[PDB]
Design a protein around this ligand. Structure first.
Ligand code: NA
Length: 108
DNA sequence: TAATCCTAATCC
DNA sequence: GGATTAGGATTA
């Protein structure tokens, strides 16, 4: 019976742009964090969109691999630049570096 | 076809 | 950042 607040709407829009896939745990987390029902979160995501893995292109992979080899530390500015030039969100760039570091640690 | 490999994305 | 799963492609 209550409208989403400005902060609730803004957060939902950010979440959906970052990742439109709602797992059970993510629906529960967002429900708790936002103070909205799971049904409300689920309906809002379904309306907006009416395990998704990105297929990183050869061009995206070549750039990420080169950037990691040049510098393993990812500044916010470079994260933003790579998000812009590669068409990936900042979280995806951060996770790519994290996964690549973990793969290296698993080897040597 | 089924085993096996790579790694993006989740959950913590 | 650690642990692990899961898309999905490759290999045998
Ligand atoms: Na990744």
């Amino acid at each position: 019976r209550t409208a989403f607040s400005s902060e609730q709407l803004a957060r939902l829009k950010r979440e959906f742009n970052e990742n439109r896939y709602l797992t059970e745990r993510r629906r529960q987390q967002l429900s708790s964090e936002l103070g909205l029902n799971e049904a409300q979160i689920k309906i809002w995501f379904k309306n907006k969109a009416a395990r998704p893995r990105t297929a990183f292109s050869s061009e995206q992979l070549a750039r990420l691999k080169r950037e990691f080899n040049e510098n393993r530390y990812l500044t916010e500015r470079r994260r933003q630049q790579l998000s812009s030039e590669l068409g990936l969100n900042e979280a995806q760039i951060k996770i790519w570096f994290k996964n690549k570091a973990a793969k290296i640690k698993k080897s040597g």
